[PDB]
Structure formats: C-alpha cells, structure tokens
Amino acid sequence: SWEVGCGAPVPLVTCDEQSPYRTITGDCNNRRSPALGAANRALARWLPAEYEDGLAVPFGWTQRKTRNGFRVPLAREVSNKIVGYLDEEGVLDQNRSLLFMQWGQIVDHDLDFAPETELGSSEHSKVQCEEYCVQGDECFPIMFPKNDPKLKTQGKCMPFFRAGFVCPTPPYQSLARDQINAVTSFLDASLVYGSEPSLASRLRNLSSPLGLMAVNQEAWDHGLAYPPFNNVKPSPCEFINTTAHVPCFQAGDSRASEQILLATVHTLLLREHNRLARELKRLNPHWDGEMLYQEARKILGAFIQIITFRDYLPIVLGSEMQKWIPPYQGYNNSVDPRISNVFTFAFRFGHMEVPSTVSRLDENYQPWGPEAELPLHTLFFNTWRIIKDGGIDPLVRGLLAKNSKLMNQNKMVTSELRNKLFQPTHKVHGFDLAAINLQRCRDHGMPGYNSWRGFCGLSQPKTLKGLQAVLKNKVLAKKLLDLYKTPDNIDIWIGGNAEPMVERGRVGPLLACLLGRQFQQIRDGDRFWWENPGVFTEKQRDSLQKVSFSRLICDNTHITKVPLHAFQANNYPHDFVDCSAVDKLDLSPWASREN
Ligand code: HEM
Ligand SMILES: *[C@@H]1O[C@H](CO)[C@@H](O[C@@H]2O[C@H](CO)[C@@H](O[C@@H]3O[C@H](CO)[C@@H](O)[C@H](O)[C@@H]3O)[C@H](O)[C@H]2NC(C)=O)[C@H](O)[C@H]1NC(C)=O
Ligand SMILES: *[C@@H]1O[C@H](CO)[C@@H](O[C@@H]2O[C@H](CO)[C@@H](O[C@H]3O[C@H](CO)[C@@H](O)[C@H](O)[C@@H]3O)[C@H](O)[C@H]2NC(C)=O)[C@H](O)[C@H]1NC(C)=O
Ligand SMILES: *[C@@H]1O[C@H](CO)[C@@H](O[C@@H]2O[C@H](CO)[C@@H](O[C@H]3O[C@H](CO)[C@@H](O)[C@H](O)[C@@H]3O)[C@H](O)[C@H]2NC(C)=O)[C@H](O)[C@H]1NC(C)=O
Ligand SMILES: *[C@@H]1O[C@H](CO)[C@@H](O[C@@H]2O[C@H](CO)[C@@H](O)[C@H](O)[C@H]2NC(C)=O)[C@H](O)[C@H]1NC(C)=O
Ligand SMILES: [C-]#N
Numbered sequence: 001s002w003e004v005g006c007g008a009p010v011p012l013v014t015c016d017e018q019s020p021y022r023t024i025t026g027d028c029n030n031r032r033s034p035a036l037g038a039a040n041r042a043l044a045r046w047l048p049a050e051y052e053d054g055l056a057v058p059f060g061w062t063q064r065k066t067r068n069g070f071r072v073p074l075a076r077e078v079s080n081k082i083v084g085y086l087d088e089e090g091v092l093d094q095n096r097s098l099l100f101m102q103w104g105q106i107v108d109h110d111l112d113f114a115p116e117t118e119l120g121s122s123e124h125s126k127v128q129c130e131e132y133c134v135q136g137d138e139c140f141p142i143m144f145p146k147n148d149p150k151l152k153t154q155g156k157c158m159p160f161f162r163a164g165f166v167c168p169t170p171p172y173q174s175l176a177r178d179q180i181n182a183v184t185s186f187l188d189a190s191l192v193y194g195s196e197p198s199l200a201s202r203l204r205n206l207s208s209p210l211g212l213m214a215v216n217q218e219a220w221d222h223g224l225a226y227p228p229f230n231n232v233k234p235s236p237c238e239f240i241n242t243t244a245h246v247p248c249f250q251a252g253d254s255r256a257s258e259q260i261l262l263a264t265v266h267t268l269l270l271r272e273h274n275r276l277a278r279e280l281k282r283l284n285p286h287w288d289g290e291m292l293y294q295e296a297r298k299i300l301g302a303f304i305q306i307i308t309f310r311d312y313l314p315i316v317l318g319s320e321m322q323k324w325i326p327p328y329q330g331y332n333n334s335v336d337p338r339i340s341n342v343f344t345f346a347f348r349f350g351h352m353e354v355p356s357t358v359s360r361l362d363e364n365y366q367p368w369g370p371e372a373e374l375p376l377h378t379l380f381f382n383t384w385r386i387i388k389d390g391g392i393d394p395l396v397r398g399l400l401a402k403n404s405k406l407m408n409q410n411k412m413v414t415s416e417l418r419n420k421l422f423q424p425t426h427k428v429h430g431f432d433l434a435a436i437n438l439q440r441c442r443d444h445g446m447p448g449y450n451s452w453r454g455f456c457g458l459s460q461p462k463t464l465k466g467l468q469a470v471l472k473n474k475v476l477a478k479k480l481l482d483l484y485k486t487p488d489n490i491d492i493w494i495g496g497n498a499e500p501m502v503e504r505g506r507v508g509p510l511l512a513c514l515l516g517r518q519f520q521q522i523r524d525g526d527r528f529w530w531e532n533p534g535v536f537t538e539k540q541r542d543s544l545q546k547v548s549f550s551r552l553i554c555d556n557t558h559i560t561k562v563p564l565h566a567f568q569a570n571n572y573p574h575d576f577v578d579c580s581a582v583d584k585l586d587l588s589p590w591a592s593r594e595n
C-alpha cells in the first residue's frame with residue numbers, strides 16, 4: 001500500500017486517557033488507533049474502488065470507455081425506466097408508521113456525511129456546471145436522456161458536484177480516491193451535539209451553568225424550545241418563502257432542515273437534552289455545567305443506541321437480524337468501527353420508503369386545518385411551516401398515525417423526490433434523488449452488484465434467467481438488463497433495492513448483509529457502547545432499558561396520547577394509550593451522594 005496516513009481538516013488533540021465521556025470528534029475511542037471512527041477521515045473500503053482509470057475517474061464519465069464491454073446507462077434514464085411511477089394509491093406500508101422512515105434518516109445522519117466539493121465562493125465553476133452542462137473537474141452533470149420531459153421545461157442537465165476526498169481537494173495524483181466522512185462513525189448522538197469542537201460549542205448555552213443546549217429566542221412552541229436559527233446568508237429556508245423570513249435550524253448536523261419531519265425529530269432530541277440536564281441538576285445540585293452537558297449527552301446517545309437496536313433494526317433486518325447481529329459479547333478493539341463507503345449507499349433504501357405527502361393532525365388525530373395534508377416537495381428546507389403554522393405537535397401526531405411508503409419494485413421512489421426535489425445550492429424544485437444516488441455510486445467508485453453479492457456470499461446472476469430468479473420478477477430483470485447489458489454493471493443502490501424483501505424485514509438479502517455487517521461493527525467497535533461494562537452502572541442500564549420513543553414524545557411535546565410501539569402501524573384510537581401508561585426513564589441511579 002501507499003501513504004498509510006494522508007491528512008486533511010483532521011483537528012486538535014490527544015486522549016484524556018481515562019475520561020468517561022466521548023470526545024466530540026470521535027477520536028480517542030479506540031486506544032491503539034485513536035483516529036479509528038473519528039470525523040472527517042476517509043470512508044473505509046470493504047472492497048477496492050472501481051474507477052474508469054482505477055484511480056478517481058467515475059464510470060460514465062468518458063462517454064466511450066465501457067464497463068466490462070458495455071456502456072453504462074445514463075443515471076437519469078435508469079430513473080425514468082426503473083425507478084419512477086405515477087399512481088400513489090396502495091403504496092403505503094400497512095405495518096410501518098411514518099416514524100420508521102423518519103428514524104432511519106436520523107440514524108443515517110448520525111453515522112455518515114460525505115460533503116460535496118465547495119471551491120465555490122465568488123466562483124463561476126458552478127456557472128459552467130448549472131448553465132452550460134460542461135463536464136469538468138468537479139462538475140459531473142446528470143444529462144437528460146432522449147425525450148425526457150425535463151428537457152422541454154428545465155434544461156439539458158441537472159448540476160451535480162463530485163464528493164470531497166482525502167489528501168487535498170485540488171484533485172488528480174498518487175492513490176485511489178477515497179471520500180471523506182465528516183461525522184463520527186459511532187452511534188453517539190453526534191447529529192445533536194456536532195462532530196467538530198467549534199460548532200459543538202456554539203450549540204451550547206454557556207451563559208448559565210446548567211449544561212443546556214442553546215435554544216431559539218425569536219420563537220417558542222407553547223413554551224417548549226426550538227433549535228436556534230442558523231444565520232448564515234443566504235438561507236435555503238428563507239428562499240422557499242421570502243415573505244415569512246424563517247431561517248433554517250442550526251443543529252449538530254448540517255442537514256437538519258432538509259425537510260419538515262427531520263427538523264421535527266431534531267427538536268424533540270434537543271428538548272430531551274435540556275430536560276435531562278435540568279433533571280440531573282435537581283438530583284445533583286453540586287454538579288457544574290460541563291458535567292451536566294456531558295452526563296446528559298451520554299444518556300441521549302445511549303437512548304439513540306437503545307431505540308435503534310431494540311426497536312429499529314429488528315424490523316428493518318427481519319429474520320436476518322440474528323445472522324448478522326448476534327447478542328452483545330462486549331467491546332472488541334480488533335473491530336473496525338469506521339463506516340464503509342458502500343454503507344452510505346446501502347442505507348439509502350430509506351429513499352424508497354418516503355411517501356408523497358405529510359399531514360398535520362389535531363388532538364383527536366383528525367386533519368388539522370384547511371391544508372392539513374401537504375405535498376412533500378413543498379417541505380424541503382421548510383421551517384416557516386413549523387414556526388409560523390402550528391408547531392411540532394401536529395407533525396408528531398402525523399408521524400405516529402400515518403404510514404411509511406412500502407418499497408415496491410413497480411413503484412420505487414415517489415415523484416416528490418424523483419422530479420420535484422429541492423437542493424440548497426440551486427433555485428428550482430426540479431432535481432432527482434434517484435439519478436443523484438446512481439451518479440454518486442459512480443462518483444464514489446462503487447463496485448457493481450454481483451461484486452457485492454459475492455462479498456456477501458450470494459449467487460451472482462449472469463443471465464436474464466438468473467437475474468429473474470434473484471429478483472423474483474421477469475419484467476424488472478428485463479428492464480434492468482436492457483439498460484446495463486450485464487448484472488456485473490448494475491449500480492449498487494438500485495441493484496440492492498430491486499431484490500425482494502426478506503421475511504419480516506424491509507430490505508433484501510444483499511442489503512441485510514451490508515447493513516447487518518456495518519451495524520454489528522459500530523456496536524462491537526465502540527468502547528462507549530451502552531452495554532459495555534463500566535460505561536454505565538448496573539442500576540443505570542437497568543433503567544435505560546426502559547426508554548422508548550413513546551415516552552420521548554410525552555415528556556417533550558403536548559401530545560398526550562401515543563402508541564406503545566411507535567414504529568409499527570397504529571390506528572387511532574384503538575392503539576393509542578394515555579402517556580401515563582408509558583414507562584418513564586427513572587433518573588435516580590444518577591443521583592450522586594457525597595460523603
Ligand atoms: C423525504 C426524506 C428525504 C429526503 C428529502 C432526502 C434527501 C437526500 C439528499 C438530497 C441526499 C444527497 C444525495 C447526494 O448528493 O449524494 C441524500 C443522501 C442520503 N440519504 Fe436521504 N433523504 C430523505 C430520507 C432518507 C432516509 C429515510 C434515509 C435512510 C433511512 C436516507 C438515507 C440517505 C443516506 C445514507 C444519504 C448519504 C449520506 C452520506 O453522504 O453519507 N435518506 N438524501
Ligand atoms: C409564505 O408564508 C406565509 C406565512 O408567513 C403564508 O401566508 C399565510 O397564508 C394563509 C392563507 O393563505 C393565512 O391564513 C389565513 O388566515 C387564517 C389563519 O389564522 C385562516 O382562518 C384563513 O382561512 C387563512 O388561511 C396566513 O395567516 C398567512 N400568513 C401571514 C401572516 O401572511 C403564505 O402562504 C406563504 N407563501 C408561499 C409562497 O408559500
Ligand atoms: C407488525 O409488525 C410488528 C412489529 O414486528 C409485529 O409484531 C411482532 O409480533 C411478533 C408475534 O409473533 C413478535 O415476535 C415474537 O413472538 C413470540 C413472542 O410472543 C415468539 O414466539 C417469536 O419467536 C417472536 O420473538 C414480535 O415481538 C413483534 N414485534 C415487535 C417489535 O413488537 C406484528 O406482528 C405486525 N403485524 C402484522 C399484522 O403483521
Ligand atoms: C441559557 O439559559 C438561560 C437560563 O436558563 C436562559 O435564560 C432564561 O430565559 C427565559 C426566556 O428568555 C427567561 O424566562 C422567562 O422570560 C419571560 C419573562 O421575562 C417570559 O415571558 C418567558 O416565558 C420565560 O419564562 C428567564 O429569565 C431566563 N432564566 C435565567 C435564569 O436567566 C436562556 O434563554 C438560555 N440561552 C439560550 C441562548 O438558549
Ligand atoms: C474480536 O473480533 C475479531 C474480528 O472479527 C475476532 O477475531 C477472529 O479470531 C480468529 C481466531 O480466534 C481469527 O481466525 C480470525 O481472523 C478473526 N475473525 C475474523 C474473520 O476477523 C475475535 O473473535 C474477537 N475477539 C474476541 C476476544 O472476542
Ligand atoms: C439524508 N438526507
């Protein structure tokens with residue numbers, strides 16, 4: 001190998017060596033190798049990268065270099081033929097709430113973020129990219145196929161910028177391109193607290209010695225807190241309604257305001273820190289602000305870990321759950337906690353669970369107002385609909401009482417995401433999440449379908465007949481092969497999402513393997529995992545074993561009626577109990593007695 005340690009924005013310091021608290025940047029978790037699982041280091045590679053030139057050029061770039069003897073199909077054309085649909089009826093998951101979709105995004109956001117290439121302050125590369133569709137350095141456009149309706153109304157392409165990478169950001173030399181993971185690999189509530197030391201601090205309320213996160217001073221939700229507004233200008237959130245002037249929320253992760261529902265759960269999570277922190281001060285008046293912030297943070301992260309492994313995954317992974325994530329046996333420091341490149345695509349199965357509309361519901365779970373149900377595309381970077389239109393309570397009720405979208409081979413991604421997506425950089429609601437994903441697999445140098453199937457010890461189909469057998473679907477196998485010419489060339493995101501679901505789960509065998517592996521690792525390789533002896537006392541684990549998203553809603557909103565099991569589909573009122581029937585989190589084991 002080469003350069004066993006390139007170095008970018010990699011920040012400050014070394015290990016306090018005997019500290020009970022995680023670091024913000026994720027350093028110092030693993031003792032032999034401190035930077036393992038830290039922020040803005042390279043995404044790991046479970047398989048060697050596959051570029052057109054085996055270094056950094058994407059497949060599909062040079063529009064005459066094949067991939068295994070054949071041209072790769074335009075990303076947007078796969079989108080038009082495989083991924084799209086029109087009829088929104090019958091599309092809802094009969095046994096998953098909207099919350100199931102939404103939690104996956106929160107988990108995702110905690111684990112991985114590959115930023116796009118900036119170099120774009122007082123610049124005209126973006127011009128050459130947006131206006132003239134010129135493939136360039138970082139400009140890797142998504143061209144419109146023949147007779148694409150967006151040709152007549154939008155342009156010749158969608159702008160798309162290549163991901164950031166390790167050594168510098170001025171590009172082409174020495175090794176194979178690795179993309180950066182700007183967040184911590186551990187499931188450590190980093191989307192709440194930040195992954196960089198500076199932001200983590202701007203996010204804190206340092207005026208009082210109470211250990212609270214900072215809250216919004218312009219606006220309130222019936223006495224309950226909101227995230228502070230980001231004041232960076234211009235703002236995507238101001239743009240979608242300049243008459244309302246409501247900026248984006250400012251949280252631990254940059255993408256917090258990407259859509260009304262994500263911002264909602266971010267608020268919920270911010271409110272829980274503050275609750276915990278003033279609760280921990282009651283039991284322990286002697287504790288200073290740093291200890292409050294820290295002890296709060298630590299419990300919140302365990303909560304994320306608990307909700308995610310106890311309730312989330314067993315219903316994503318299905319019967320494959322035990323195969324890939326067997327019972328915890330303790331911290332193992334040989335295990336690589338880093339997030340792999342292919343995971344950042346494997347976890348995008350969520351994009352196909354996103355439904356076309358969002359609802360607000362009153363205290364009886366009935367439509368809340370004249371426009372209770374809104375098209376999803378009007379809610380990207382939309383914080384005015386929270387601050388200036390009813391608060392989070394109506395949205396939270398929707399999360400519990402509505403269904404997610406079910407992954408359908410004939411109905412893959414809704415048109416709200418497939419044609420009408422909004423991007424912060426640009427001005428139109430005209431982007432394509434499905435095209436963008438496929439273009440990104442290429443950008444990140446993803447190996448193909450069969451190569452990942454092989455990685456997970458699965459049959460590698462070579463012919464139509466064999467692809468039909470894997471996909472249990474003659475027509476999708478045909479459509480897939482007319483475009484790719486061979487299964488070896490099938491991009492991973494779509495390949496893995498076309499497969500039939502595993503019994504009692506929401507992803508197929510390949511994805512269950514890819515997600516299974518990663519989650520198993522981020523668990524076993526985390527020294528601060530909640531079940532690791534010595535991180536929490538027996539009394540604290542026993543008590544944390546009782547948390548549930550249902551209680552989180554009770555203690556942080558004015559929703560008084562919630563389901564016991566929030567992730568599955570629940571009907572009102574049969575399935576909703578009063579908040580008093582929901583176990584509390586008992587904070588007594590945190591009471592620190594002096595002498
Ligand atoms: C309406 C809801 C959602 C919207 C509007 C949305 C939008 C987006 C956008 C614009 C990107 C950037 C893609 C790129 O430039 O490469 C993205 C990436 C991504 N999405 Fe989503 N998304 C949504 C829900 C979800 C859900 C529910 C999940 C998972 C369960 C998910 C998983 C991911 C992942 C893993 C990435 C890449 C993260 C990384 O860079 O490491 N998304 N999404
Ligand atoms: C941009 O945001 C503003 C909100 O700041 C939106 O204007 C709002 O429009 C609605 C009706 O179109 C107004 O509600 C009306 O009044 C009462 C509500 O108390 C209701 O009984 C009526 O039936 C009616 O719906 C709302 O007050 C108004 N807000 C203000 C203060 O102007 C506007 O819709 C947004 N525009 C865009 C471009 O989306
Ligand atoms: C909708 O999804 C629900 C969430 O998975 C699901 O509830 C699940 O029900 C099964 C019942 O078989 C439980 O599985 C366990 O059942 C017994 C224990 O009583 C054992 O013999 C089994 O080996 C197994 O461990 C799950 O615990 C339960 N899942 C959760 C997380 O609550 C519903 O069945 C689904 N509803 C419909 C109508 O399909
Ligand atoms: C940092 O923490 C501070 C202490 O908790 C907090 O100060 C508190 O702010 C609230 C609201 O600004 C004030 O309480 C009341 O103010 C008016 C009455 O003047 C009422 O209308 C409100 O409903 C509210 O109850 C408190 O006076 C104040 N507490 C203390 C001890 O000074 C800050 O808000 C926090 N700063 C940030 C940026 O989050
Ligand atoms: C920690 O996890 C590692 C990595 O999975 C395990 O190491 C295995 O150990 C065996 C010998 O006991 C080797 O043959 C393998 O190379 C390792 N497995 C693989 C495929 O990596 C180990 O089981 C774990 N250690 C403890 C103490 O639990
Ligand atoms: C994810 N967005």
Ligand SMILES: [Ca+2]
Binds near residue numbers: 110184185187190191
């Ligand atoms: Ca994290």
